[PDB]
Amino acid sequence: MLTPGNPKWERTNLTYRIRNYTPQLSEAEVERAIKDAFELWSVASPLIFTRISQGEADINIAFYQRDHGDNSPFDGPNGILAHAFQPGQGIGGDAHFDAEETWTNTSANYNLFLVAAHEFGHSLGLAHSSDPGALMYPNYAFRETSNYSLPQDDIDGIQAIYG
Numbered sequence: 454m455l456t457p458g459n460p461k462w463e464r465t466n467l468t469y470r471i472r473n474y475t476p477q478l479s480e481a482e483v484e485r486a487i488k489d490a491f492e493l494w495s496v497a498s499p500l501i502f503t504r505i506s507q508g509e510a511d512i513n514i515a516f517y518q519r520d521h522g523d524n525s526p527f528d529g530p531n532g533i534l535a536h537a538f539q540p541g542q543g544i545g546g547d548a549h550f551d552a553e554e555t556w557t558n559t560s561a562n563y564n565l566f567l568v569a570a571h572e573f574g575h576s577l578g579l580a581h582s583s584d585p586g587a588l589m590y591p592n593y594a595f596r597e598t599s600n601y602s603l604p605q606d607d608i609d610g611i612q613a614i615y616g
């Protein structure tokens with residue numbers, strides 16, 4: 454359940470930056486979803502996420518449409534919701550979300566908190582899990598985001614990489 458080559462961050466205090474926003478949510482809701490998604494991983498690892506408002510962060514978050522400068526283009530409504538890059542410099546660790554989705558912070562498709570939480574797993578070096586109850590399962594499926602907590606399989610995965 455660990456990315457090929459087992460790449461990971463050489464540091465536990467990582468910065469992130471939301472570059473732009475989606476018309477589907479208020480800017481604050483996006484920040485809330487993002488900050489909460491990072492927290493999911495922080496409570497199960499040594500990772501500490503620090504937000505910056507400008508400049509390059511270790512993990513840049515952005516909403517893009519179709520072709521957006523990195524070859525893994527998005528595909529319009531539905532289908533690919535987002536993607537991220539394994540730990541590394543430059544684009545490594547970055548997380549891109551399809552700007553053509555009906556993003557939400559509720560259970561309706563698609564909850565940004567859950568998708569971001571998922572992608573950050575990749576941003577941290579986690580690969581997919583075959584466990585349907587895992588956040589890193591290959592397919593999205595809303596889960597009660599209320600008292601939602603990182604599934605044990607993902608705890609195992611993140612732990613296996615950073616303790």
Ligand SMILES: COc1ccc(-c2ccc(S(=O)(=O)N[C@@H](C(C)C)P(=O)(O)O)cc2)cc1
Nearest residue numbers: 533534535536567568571588590591592593
């Ligand atoms: C609450 O649990 C989950 C939440 C979101 C996903 C999820 C699954 C697939 C995608 S994807 O948009 O299909 N991207 C995949 C790929 C086509 C680029 P990948 O980034 O997961 O590899 C995004 C989020 C899975 C589980």
Ligand SMILES: [Ca+2]
Nearest residue numbers: 511543544545
């Ligand atoms: Ca980066």
Ligand SMILES: [Ca+2]
Nearest residue numbers: 529531533551
């Ligand atoms: Ca899409």
Ligand SMILES: [Zn+2]
Nearest residue numbers: 521523525549
């Ligand atoms: Zn991209």
Ligand SMILES: [Zn+2]
Nearest residue numbers: 571575581591
């Ligand atoms: Zn994934």
